[PDB]
Amino acid sequence: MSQLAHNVNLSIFEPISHHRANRIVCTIGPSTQSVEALKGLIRSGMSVARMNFSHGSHEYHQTTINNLRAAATELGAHIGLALDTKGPEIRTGLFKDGGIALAPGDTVLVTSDPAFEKIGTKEKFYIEYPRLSITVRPGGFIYIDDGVLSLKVLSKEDEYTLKCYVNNAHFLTDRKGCNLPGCEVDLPAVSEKDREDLKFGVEQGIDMVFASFIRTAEQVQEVREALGEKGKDILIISKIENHQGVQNIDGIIEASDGIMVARGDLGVEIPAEKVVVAQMILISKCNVAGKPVICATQMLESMTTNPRPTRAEVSDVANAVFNGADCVMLSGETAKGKYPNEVVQYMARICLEAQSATNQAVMFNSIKKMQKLPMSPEEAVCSSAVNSVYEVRAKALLVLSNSGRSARLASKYRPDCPIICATTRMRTCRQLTITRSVDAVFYDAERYGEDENKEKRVQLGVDCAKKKGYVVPGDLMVVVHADHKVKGYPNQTRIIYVS
Amino acid sequence: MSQLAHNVNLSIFEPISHHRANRIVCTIGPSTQSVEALKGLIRSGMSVARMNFSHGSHEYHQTTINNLRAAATELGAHIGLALDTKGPEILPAVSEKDREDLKFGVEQGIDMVFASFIRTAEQVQEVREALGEKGKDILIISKIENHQGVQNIDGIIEASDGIMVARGDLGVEIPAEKVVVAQMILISKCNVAGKPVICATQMLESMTTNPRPTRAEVSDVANAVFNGADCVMLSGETAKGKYPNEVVQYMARICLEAQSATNQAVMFNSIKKMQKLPMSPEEAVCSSAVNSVYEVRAKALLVLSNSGRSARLASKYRPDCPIICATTRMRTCRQLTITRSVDAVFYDAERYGEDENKEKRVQLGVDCAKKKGYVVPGDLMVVVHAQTRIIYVS
Amino acid sequence: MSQLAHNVNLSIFEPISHHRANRIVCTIGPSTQSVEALKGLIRSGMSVARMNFSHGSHEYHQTTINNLRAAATELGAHIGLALDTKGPEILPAVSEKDREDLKFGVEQGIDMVFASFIRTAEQVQEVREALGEKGKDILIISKIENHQGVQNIDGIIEASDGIMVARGDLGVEIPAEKVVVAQMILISKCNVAGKPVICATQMLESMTTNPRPTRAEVSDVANAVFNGADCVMLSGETAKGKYPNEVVQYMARICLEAQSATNQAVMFNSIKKMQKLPMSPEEAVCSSAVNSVYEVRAKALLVLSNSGRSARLASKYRPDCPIICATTRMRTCRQLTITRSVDAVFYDAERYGEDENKEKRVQLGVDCAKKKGYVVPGDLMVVVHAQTRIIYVS
Amino acid sequence: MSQLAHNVNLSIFEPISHHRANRIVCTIGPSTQSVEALKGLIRSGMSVARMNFSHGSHEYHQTTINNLRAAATELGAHIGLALDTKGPEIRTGLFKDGGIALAPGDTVLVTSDPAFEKIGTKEKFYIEYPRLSITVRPGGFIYIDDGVLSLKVLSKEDEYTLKCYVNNAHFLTDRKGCNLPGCEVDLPAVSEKDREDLKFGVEQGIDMVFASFIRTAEQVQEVREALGEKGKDILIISKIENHQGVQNIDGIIEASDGIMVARGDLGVEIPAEKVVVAQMILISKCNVAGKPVICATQMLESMTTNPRPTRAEVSDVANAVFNGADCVMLSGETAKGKYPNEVVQYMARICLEAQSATNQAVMFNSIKKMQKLPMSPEEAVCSSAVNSVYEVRAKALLVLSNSGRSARLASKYRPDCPIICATTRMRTCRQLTITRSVDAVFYDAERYGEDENKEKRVQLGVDCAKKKGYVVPGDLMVVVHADHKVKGYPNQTRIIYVS
Ligand SMILES: O=S(=O)(O)c1ccc(/N=N/c2ccc(/N=N/c3c(O)c(S(=O)(=O)O)cc4cc(S(=O)(=O)O)ccc34)c(S(=O)(=O)O)c2)cc1
Ligand SMILES: O=S(=O)(O)c1ccc(/N=N/c2ccc(/N=N/c3c(O)c(S(=O)(=O)O)cc4cc(S(=O)(=O)O)ccc34)c(S(=O)(=O)O)c2)cc1
Ligand SMILES: [K+]
């Protein structure tokens, strides 16, 4: 069929029968930190709770953590726990009188020189980045205050100071943030504060990290060292925020466990129309790598204070799903907004609509056609299981995979049914929450044994699919698991009748 | 190749070598009515001037008409002129004010009507009867505004010459998420029909009074193009806006990015796989000419069509190059401004002769393509005429 | 890839690395009846011994039966035993002599019947009722001999376990050129049904009394295999012939060349594209196992099937490697000798246990493949059991 | 669709509606040299008359030529005229008593030494090939008398003499022919007799040559020189007769205008089962090169004296057509047989049946898929015209091509309708007779003018298709021709209604 052929046969009035495959990441804050409010989130469709370590102390976050664990255990939900780092920031200094008026056609001196720190004026002020004169060059741009103030660099005046053309009127106040479009920003992967944050996260047993401002594969390697041997199983989702991150996306994808497309930050740097396309490129490379991709910022922002978003906003969410994103993320809408439950429920309705309006077989065929023949046994088995789901119209795909690898591999092939992953580890259950289509179920091997014949895990997976309404008796399921000899990957498939 | 494989191989920082295929409708009002303001719009990327008959008098819009013709003649451009009806309100197809505005438009040589609040196929027939015999060559673009229009879309497409997706109107009745999917349905049914489709309302609204739009609005525009729309339309942004030229140039730049980001071969294959066998000679000749554009990597497709019909038919199949249409009618030049990929070029038969052996019209299409930097000597073009040719440009 | 691209890339002087998939039926008579002559046939490539009940008495054929079992036991081989009925002559399905010969065959443990002069589906039901309850597991291969059999082939295939294309009989009634095309139709309908098809009569007739056949006869044999036949059958060449061993070895060599010259993936795709969606679990598992053989380039497919059903079902899909079938029944070993690609291996459950976890039968299939030089440690195999596995041979 | 899907839907009782696309080459001789008998041949389905210059003088052949021209002109037929060369032969000498009995396990001495010419015996006899001891080596084989006598070379005795093992009983008589399997046979492309034959052929205006025993591309080049500037437009069809010809088939195809698969000769040299496959390989390489391929010898041999062939024979003809051959050839069946008209008519019935039982779209798709993209304009136009024929179900394809190149290019794409070729040259009409699907029609430009607008040739082509029953008014035809600027290839297509 094709996406076109799918479109002309949709009826937008028919009820949707699909089960929601995309996953919703929610940022926690004042509107949602309480145990009751977390319960609301989870009931409304939250699969991952994000802690924004730009704001708050460790105890603030500790309370998010403890409250999330009480609420989840009460509901019997597995909910991913994400730590989103502050990252290194480029800020200005102070200004006599707390701010300066700058007018287009003004020139201004920008100095990385510490002695102008707290005495900025309209003629000259401080900017924290020591490699200022090195990284930025006649003709390049410095953007300040969420990119509204645009400066074009005329010249280098001394090693400390650049002369700059003011592109637009702006009132600049103490400590605003700066961006350097198209530049190689010589800043560490992880700040000093980040290490300590990461160390907290490891101790508290987070599931994943959202690593800010990832620009090179080597920096992902730095995040990996900072988590250490103790955090070696924590996922690193690299946040792509600038041109350099988009340039190096291949090395960054290969080094990371997933990607976050941070559209707001990308937009300070890059024209809005190229951000739309960067989002597509990034999500698609992630789809082909079989690694989760999260779409973030500027989601349903207006629903932070209004009881409804604009249509342009709802279309931006849907098209994240149509581009292929595994996840969509809420920020202030859940953290400080007035409508945290409704935004999440609405986000989940948008996801359902997009999923139903997508021709899922076409994504399966696209991915499949990119495999080299001969395929490895592992790839052959997952792709063949997904095909089977299409051929017999099975209603769930059950994967026995302890680490979740094998659930991320089926999901990459995009079956049109839910994927159940039976795993011996709770951390896998929580880590699977960013992967499209997947519901993990925990197999307690301490209590029920090693299950060498896989029979208790196959029954558990089938039970999980019955409880969720995915299957009834007489429906088919496709099962993927290891034999009695292979370790590392399931090399074995069954097509079973639900009983 | 697939959209998926196209996306992974894109470089967003490479310069774009494509030539903009999507077309931009602009609403004319106080910001844009003067001769010099229309010149700027046309330079900025306007292909169609819309007159919103919900507001102003006949004499108001007469000024638009007269200034548009002055501005377009001066630049050498063929610009479609559209009359967008008030429609009825709180129903009949056309109100009494509508009958009068349509009679005026017929009298003033309009190209097309945007008919408000089309709910059924029979209603499109009433607009047609209202344009009558004298308005029989004016195009009707039915505006889809409510659930019933969405429901009756197959019959309304069959009866109309095109469709306008009025997102803001639909969103009063239908939840936002179903307007998003209704847009997809309407655009793709009109792609399969071979008929122009215009995306309207809520485009870059914020640029009415700000110098830059939000990314979400930029994404909504790119999405209209990805969905398959021929045209995007501007309302207040150009009618009342503070930055009319800038919002047009910007809407142009978005279209071009979306276009470069699209795997056009996928659209072509998908349209082609829907064709009944055996095809009519007409379908076969146009799909096969487009197929040849892909096979020999031609850099332009040239259609000789006096009515513009076979230009629309080639455009349906989505070649990944510009379509030049040599026509003996100015009115066809204006009417093709809503058709994706087409640059019309007028062949003056009075001046140059009847051209039975098509040779002069072929040389005109080729020089038109050279003039625009679409081709240079040694490139390939595919030519369709009343017949197909594959030629080297010299 | 296509048959066309396979042919241009073939090298006829390269050694063949394929393992012979097609199967050879031999008629037993005076040239071939002794224990030592049957040993030679079996070594030469016989998979099925045919007894032509048009001639000789019960006691004559009893000797064949007893000598075949002695010879096969000695070599360790499972050889199908077939009873080919006289049929009626100048009509009923089965004559009186037929009822008696069938009763004898049922009593002697035959594998399959070749039922002469099948004209309708109802006639196949009469042969079935004549084998009765005691002969309910004997296969009926309906011999197609006239225009009516050809006409009623869909119903006759549905009712039978297989078909025999009796070219010489068909050629009495139907022009030679329509027998050529009727052969194509019957073979391809049985390929699509998943049921064995035997090509018979006029195979290498001239080798009855000469040491070499003509090229035209060699071509007719290769053609049967290209058409899609599971099996080729020898009559007088082995029954009365001067060179029985040589005609078998030669028929084997022809099959192997035709096989090497066939693009097997094309047959697989063509069969697979006929499948209704949704498939049954059984169709899905076998096509998908064969698909995997092509995807990972496995060197053998192993089916655990006690009845041989899923071995026939995998064979339908035409993998380009050997199919090993581990079965708990000798009778299934004998019955699979008419099924393209299959080497059956007997799993002695009495000796080795019930094997619920399939492990011993899997190790048996793998060692069977090693023993025949189909695989070596490090190759891939695909295993189907009551479930699919892709395994490295160790 | 596929060939399989085509097969299961055939009814072999339905009348055939197709028009015969394959072409029948007939060898002329005593049964068929008369003007009346040529007329019978032509009426029965002959498209090419072959002269076998192994037998007969120039005047014998002159009479074939003059009689063929009278019969064809009387019928208004274009009939190809082929000269099939003798070629160099390897013969034995004489034997005392006119022949020797040789028994398996005998050894015998074979000598290329002239002085044993006329005095052969059971112990030693003469064989004409001076490079005997050089070309054939311990372990190689010499085959004699249409390959029934097999000798295995034990050793070289002197420069002149090989010692040989007799593989089988045989009675050997004066002058029998010898073959050297798997050998590089050091013999000229063209004998002395061949040159003179070729010279006759050029003078008499033959259409094509069947060149015997072509083993290398360089030898085709030698045939080309021997025809000369005067014969530069005569087609060379290379006869492939041994292993070396099959080894070098690529260079030979590229140098020749077509191929003849000479199955009988191949069979002396190569096991019968490998001949079947060589035939497939050769025909398919020819199909992809868009050059005619003729299948020859051992066709319906038994119908030389019997009023009907065996089924094995009829199947061998059909499968030449199914392999893709443009032509099938009769030899003694028409030259000396008792049933020359019936064999030809029957051969044409077999061709019809095979054509109808072939899925022609599958050959079109196979050929098409072997083109590199970007295609040249010429290839794009022919393949696109053939596609059009399939898409609109046109009933003829009309190609305006003076040299016939463009008719050979459509035919390669295998449309399921007849191809009409309008050409300004009678020699093209006669040369097109070996090309599948094609009926040429002569456009007399001397009389009707240059037809710069192509309109008289398009009408002529349509008239030709009406006269032959291919089209009626309201049917469609696809037309391929040049514009007012392109020379060398038609770059222009029309789809027209027949009126
Ligand atoms: O939604 S959209 O954005 O697309 C959109 C569509 C239509 C729109 N219509 N806008 C207008 C603007 C002016 C206008 N009439 N002005 C005048 C007037 O009314 C009178 S009167 O005495 O009271 O009659 C005397 C005047 C004397 C002079 S002057 O002496 O030369 O200075 C100049 C003008 C007027 C009219 S309308 O003709 O009344 O309809 C309509 C706007 C937006
Ligand atoms: O078409 S196919 O090529 O597949 C095909 C199918 C079946 C075919 N059947 N061939 C035969 C051969 C012999 C034969 N009976 N022989 C004997 C016999 O008859 C008598 S009796 O006194 O007259 O009864 C006494 C004998 C004493 C001795 S001895 O004392 O040990 O030397 C040995 C033999 C016989 C029979 S049958 O049993 O009569 O039917 C059938 C052949 C070909
Ligand atoms: K953060």
Ligand SMILES: [K+]
């Ligand atoms: K309006």
Ligand SMILES: [K+]
């Ligand atoms: K019989």
Ligand SMILES: [K+]
């Ligand atoms: K000859």
